[PDB]
Design a protein around this ligand. Structure first.
Ligand SMILES: [Cl-]
Length: 129
């Protein structure tokens, strides 16, 4: 599923991401835009052999099991394919664990490079929330 901007904002808000660990909703929407272009089916392979999955590009090196990343952990205790669902529940629940781990949203390279320090409120502007 390819979400609309406001559609995703509302789904994320419903799932408790607004101001989660101090990160306003606009941060999460911005991250999803540049990580996956709002596409729940996005996948990308990394140099080390791990793969990033879903709307928030969660990495199989640490967070999910895809059966092909030897010596990796599965800290979210889920198969990576669960992160590709049209239902964003699994992605959100895992993102909450990631953002709580000490490094905040800096875990997401696109957030650090393209959202951090910008006017992220612009990403939820006009939305019915
Ligand atoms: Cl933080």
């Amino acid at each position: 599923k390819v979400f609309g901007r406001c559609e995703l904002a509302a789904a994320m808000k419903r799932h408790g991401l607004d101001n989660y660990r101090g990160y306003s909703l606009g941060n999460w929407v911005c991250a999803a835009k540049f990580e996956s272009n709002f596409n729940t089916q996005a996948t990308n392979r990394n140099t080390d052999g791990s793969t990033d999955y879903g709307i928030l590009q969660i990495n199989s090196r640490w967070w999910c099991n895809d059966g092909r990343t030897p010596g990796s952990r599965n800290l979210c205790n889920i198969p990576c394919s669960a992160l590709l669902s049209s239902d964003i529940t699994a992605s959100v629940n895992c993102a909450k664990k990631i953002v709580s781990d000490g490094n905040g949203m800096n875990a997401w390279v696109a957030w650090r490079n393209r959202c951090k320090g910008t006017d992220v409120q612009a990403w939820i502007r006009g939305c019915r929330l």
